[PDB]
């Protein structure tokens, strides 16, 4: 199956998923000088106060924290969006070194990791239906740089022991995602896709200008996960990121000057 290795990495995905070569694929490099400042952009509205996390699991590609998206508990609104988007899960993409890991790049600069808070448009009924629409999902991209520790990430870090191998999951209730947000909500936005197969072009990418910083040992724990299941030969989960795709006939709007 697809993965991030030489024989099943991103440069092979198109063979099983032709959309890999589509017109609005992510991630892309964000050129700060050619991004158009759009004054008609509203501020983002991130309502994560009623967020209910439930479980965290290693799905072979990364660890995911899932939330109870049965009701509008943690929604994203405003910004370039029209409609309410419910939070369903969040994951990370990191590297084997501190100078790579982010999918999106700013002026060709890569960050240690990138957090993705995934939401689906509520006018579509369920996630399954949202993925069949050009405006079905909204993903909040947040870069992570190495520096001081982010206290809000530590709770996630401690539990990685329990989900070391593919398929393992653990209960992860009462987690407040608000602790992983930067001070500023200034963003860049553009229409794109999922960065992993099936590579569907249903996403409105909202990438924040301000990155959060985590410690060296915090991201270190990330690199100790396993792509493989228990028993199989160990394959360290690192560099689970896709390289930037051509921007093509698209424009990146900035919510700031």
Ligand X SMILES: CN[C@@H]1CN(c2cccc(OC)c2)S(=O)(=O)c2sc(S(N)(=O)=O)cc21
Told to check if 89 binds ligand X by CB under 6 A, we report yes
- What DSSP string runs through 199-219? --S-EEEEEESSPEEE-HHHH
Interacting residues with Zn ion (CB under 5 A): 116
Q: Which residues pair with 91 in a beta bridge?
A: 64, 116
194 belongs to the binding site for ligand X (CB under 6 A):
yes
Q: Which residues contact 20 (CB under 8 A, 6 or more apart)?
A: 10, 13, 14, 197, 199
Active site residue 7: no
Tokens of 156: 């996630």
Question: Do the annotations mark residue 93 as ligand-binding?
Answer: yes
Give the number of residues in contact with ligand X, rule: CB under 6 A.
10
Task: Considering the candidates 1, 61, 104, 119, report the single residue annotated as catalytic.
Answer: 61
- CA pair distance 2, 134, nearest whole angstrom: 24
* Residue 140 binds to ligand X (criterion: CB under 6 A): no
Query: Would the annotation count 14 as a binding residue?
Result: no
In angstroms, what is the minimal distance from the CB of 195 to Zn ion? Answer: 5
Q: How far is the CB of 242 from Zn ion (least distance, A)?
A: 9
Query: Binding residue per annotation — 1?
Result: no
Non-local (6+) Cβ contacts of 241 within 8 A are: 4, 93, 94, 95, 100, 101, 102, 103, 114, 195
Q: 197 to 226, contacts with ligand X by CB under 6 A?
A: 198
Q: Residues forming the annotated binding site for Zn(2+)?
A: 91, 93, 116
- The contact set with ligand X (CB under 6 A) reads 61, 89, 116, 118, 131, 139, 194-196, 198
């Amino acid at each position: 199956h697809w993965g991030y290795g030489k024989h099943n990495g991103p440069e092979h995905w198109h063979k099983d998923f032709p959309i890999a070569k589509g017109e609005r694929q992510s991630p892309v490099d964000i050129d700060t000088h050619t991004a158009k400042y759009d004054p008609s952009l509203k501020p983002l509205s991130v309502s994560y106060d009623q967020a209910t996390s439930l479980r965290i699991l290693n799905n072979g590609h990364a660890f995911n924290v899932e939330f109870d998206d049965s009701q509008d508990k943690a929604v994203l609104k405003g910004g370039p969006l029209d409609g309410t988007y419910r939070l369903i899960q969040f994951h990370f993409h990191w590297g084997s070194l501190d100078g790579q890991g982010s999918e999106h790049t700013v002026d060709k600069k890569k960050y240690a990791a990138e957090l993705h808070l995934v939401h689906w448009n509520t006018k579509y009924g369920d996630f399954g239906k949202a993925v069949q629409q050009p405006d079905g999902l909204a993903v909040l991209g947040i870069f992570l740089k190495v520096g001081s520790a982010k206290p809000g990430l530590q709770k996630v870090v401690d539990v990685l022991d329990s989900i070391k191998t593919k398929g393992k999951s653990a209960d992860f209730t009462n987690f407040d995602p608000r602790g992983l947000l930067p001070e500023s909500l200034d963003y860049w936005t553009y229409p794109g896709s999922l960065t992993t197969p099936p590579l569907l072009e249903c996403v409105t990418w909202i990438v924040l200008k301000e990155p959060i910083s985590v410690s060296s040992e915090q991201v270190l724990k990330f690199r100790k996960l396993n792509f493989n299941g228990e028993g199989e030969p160990e394959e360290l989960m690192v560099d689970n990121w896709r390289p930037a795709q051509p921007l093509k006939n698209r424009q990146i709007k900035a919510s700031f000057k």
